[PDB]
Design a binder for this molecule. Sequence first.
Ligand SMILES: [K+]
Ligand SMILES: [Mg+2]
Ligand SMILES: [Mg+2]
Ligand SMILES: [Mg+2]
Length: 134
Amino acid sequence: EEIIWESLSVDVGSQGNPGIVEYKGVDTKTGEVLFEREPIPIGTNNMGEFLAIVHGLRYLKERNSRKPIYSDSQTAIKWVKDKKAKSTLVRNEETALIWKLVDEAEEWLNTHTYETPILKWQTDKWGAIKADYG
RNA sequence: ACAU
DNA sequence: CGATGT
Ligand SMILES: [K+]
Ligand SMILES: [Mg+2]
Ligand SMILES: [Mg+2]
Ligand SMILES: [Mg+2]
C-alpha cells in the first residue's frame, strides 16, 4: 500500500494529557501548514485528534477539495465515523471550552455531508505523520 | 493486543 | 514512567 500524497494530514500536540491541546493540518506532500488551532487550555489527545479531523473536513469542503485526510489516531477516526466523540474527560469549568468545541464538531457532522475519505496513516511503515508535533 |  | 482510547 502506498501513501496518497494528494491529501491533508492532521495531528494533535499537547502539553500534558489531559493538558494543553493544539492541532494542525498540513499538505502531506509539501508539509505546508494549512491550518493550526490556537492552544486549548485543557483537553485530551483524542479530543484534539477528533477536532483536527473534523476541522480538516470543514476546511476541504469549504474549498471544494476532494482530497482525503490522514490521521494516525484509530480512536479519532472511529469517533468521526460514528459522529460521536466518546471521551472520558470530566465536564467542569476547566474543560468547558474543549467540550463545547467537541459538541459543536459533532453537531457539524450531524448537519453536513462529505465524501472525504478518512485514512489511517500507517506509522509503522511510513514514519511519523507529516503533521506531527516533533 | 492495537492506535495514540 | 504517566494518560487517552477501541
Ligand atoms: K492502555
Ligand atoms: Mg497523532
Ligand atoms: Mg504526533
Ligand atoms: Mg508525541
